[PDB]
């Protein structure tokens, strides 16, 4: 168990443009292409991300390249972010992986907004953070994934994913 396996589990792998659980164009391993409703805007974005004339289809190698880029950006956004970095710094390894999950999934901005849980995590009030985390749109939209990520933070083990 690592952050790569963890996310690959949570997001799936899809080699052809598809629609996210909220309506958005996505591809590979959880990579958001566009929030616009144009499939055309979406092959163009994809086209652009990959560096060749896609077609709306990528190889597995291509998908992993994007993934590697996205995990990177996530880690680097956390470390850069003044609100996020101290939370991350205070956590153990398992729990850091889950924090990364939460940011990949939702944006550095996104979660820099998850104010109270951030402060609960930092204060190592696991149970309470878990309850607060579940009180979100995120949770209510994708409850099975969210539960897995929340248990990982609540427990510090990889149980939800064996």
Binding residues for substrate: 32, 104, 117, 132
The first and second tokens of residue 20, run together, are 């996210």
Establish whether 22 is a catalytic residue: no
Residue with tokens 């149970």: 127
Report helix, strand or coil for 14.
Answer: strand
Nearer to Cl ion, 3 or 33 (CB): 33
Nearer to Cl ion, 49 or 100 (CB): 49
The binding site for Cl ion (CB under 5 A) comprises: 49, 142, 144-145
124 CB neighbour count, 10 Å cutoff: 12
Nearer to Cl ion, 122 or 151 (CB): 151
Q: Minimal distance in Å, beta carbon 134 to Cl ion? A: 14
Q: Minimal distance in Å, beta carbon 124 to Cl ion? A: 27
User: What angle, 0 to 180 degrees and rounded to 10, lies between the N-to-C axes of helices 60-80 and 3-11?
Assistant: 120
Residue with tokens 């907004």: 113
Establish whether 11 is a catalytic residue: yes
Active site residues: 11, 20
């Amino acid at each position: 168990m690592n952050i790569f396996e963890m996310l690959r589990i949570d997001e799936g792998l899809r080699l052809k443009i598809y629609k996210d659980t909220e309506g958005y164009y996505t591809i590979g391993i959880g990579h958001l292409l566009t929030k616009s409703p144009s499939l055309n805007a979406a092959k163009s974005e994809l086209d652009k991300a990959i560096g060749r004339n896609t077609n709306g289809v990528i190889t597995k190698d291509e998908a992993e390249k994007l993934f590697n880029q996205d995990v990177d950006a996530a880690v680097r956004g956390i470390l850069r972010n003044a609100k996020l970095k101290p939370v991350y710094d205070s956590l153990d390894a398992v729990r850091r992986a889950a924090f990364i999950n939460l940011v990949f999934q939702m944006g550095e901005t996104g979660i820099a907004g998850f104010t109270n849980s951030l402060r609960m995590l930092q204060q190592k009030r696991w149970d309470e953070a878990a309850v607060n985390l579940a009180k979100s749109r995120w949770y209510n939209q994708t409850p099975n994934r969210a539960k897995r990520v929340i248990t990982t933070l609540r427990t510090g083990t990889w149980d939800a994913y064996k």
